[PDB]
Design a protein around this ligand. Structure first.
Ligand SMILES: NC[C@H]1CN(c2ncnc3nc[nH]c23)CCO1
Length: 251
């Protein structure tokens, strides 16, 4: 109770300790929360929102989390424009670092989007909100996912047409949609279904349409590898790390 809740960040409130003046974010949820807490405890990476502690008072549960003064990545995207390629690439590298770490401890976020990618004072990206995250590897054994989870414009196509599916290619897909957003300042489709004209157009290689026309050939080639319908053919992270644009030096 040494923390004063200065303002509502998003419920999540900015909290400043009276003694140290340290600033953290506090997630206030009145009663899923248990799993989020469990998952958070496992996490320790420079590109994932740090979990400090939790305190439960009565029916109210408090989660203490790293405060990112930068705010969300979503705010760094100019509509219809995106952001400078060098900034996009840097955010993308940090995003891959975060995801590689999560997948490495068998955890999938399941809702990767710019709203859930926060920035600190140095504009370092931090993966945020593990309320929908789940274990997909335990005791070295992979568990396929069955629950439909996410945000439609970012979800992989298999999630909509498959009874069960691999967790990793789904997170790669959403990262691809985030990259598109950063480079084009717009989302390619409402959802990845054939009833969706925009998705159908992409599967037909109509890259003279937006948002594809706005994207340079190098990053677009990477997007051609990520936004692949067949999750088995989809490029994996180790291979993304070998992509030409990924490795291209930028201003
Ligand atoms: N989408 C992120 C939530 C929570 N949020 C946050 N802002 C700053 N630091 C945070 N740490 C966790 N959530 C944070 C503001 C934006 O809404």
């Amino acid at each position: 109770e040494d923390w004063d809740l200065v303002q509502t960040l998003g419920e999540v409130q900015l909290a400043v300790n009276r003694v140290t003046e340290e600033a953290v974010a506090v997630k206030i949820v009145d009663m899923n929360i248990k799993k989020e807490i469990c998952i958070n405890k496992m996490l320790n990476h420079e590109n994932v929102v740090k979990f400090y502690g939790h305190r439960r008072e009565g029916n109210i549960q408090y989660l203490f989390l790293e405060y990112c003064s930068g705010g969300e990545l979503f705010d760094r995207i100019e509509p219809d424009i995106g952001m400078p390629e060098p900034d996009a690439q840097r955010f993308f590298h940090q995003l891959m670092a975060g995801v590689v770490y999560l997948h490495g401890i068998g955890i999938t976020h399941r809702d990767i989007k710019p709203e859930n990618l926060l920035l600190d004072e140095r504009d370092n990206l931090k993966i945020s909100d593990f309320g929908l995250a789940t274990v997909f590897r335990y005791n070295n054994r992979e568990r396929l996912l069955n629950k439909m989870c996410g945000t439609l414009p970012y979800v992989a196509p298999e999630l909509l047409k498959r009874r069960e599916f691999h967790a990793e290619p789904v997170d790669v897909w959403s990262c691809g949609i985030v990259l598109t957003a950063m480079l084009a300042g717009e989302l390619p489709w409402d959802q990845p279904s054939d009833s969706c004209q925009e998705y159908s157009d992409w599967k037909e290689k109509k890259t003279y349409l937006n948002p594809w026309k706005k994207i340079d050939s190098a990053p677009l080639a990477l997007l051609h590898k990520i936004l692949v319908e067949n999750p088995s053919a989809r490029i994996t992270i180790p291979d993304i790390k070998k992509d030409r644009w990924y490795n291209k030096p930028l201003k």
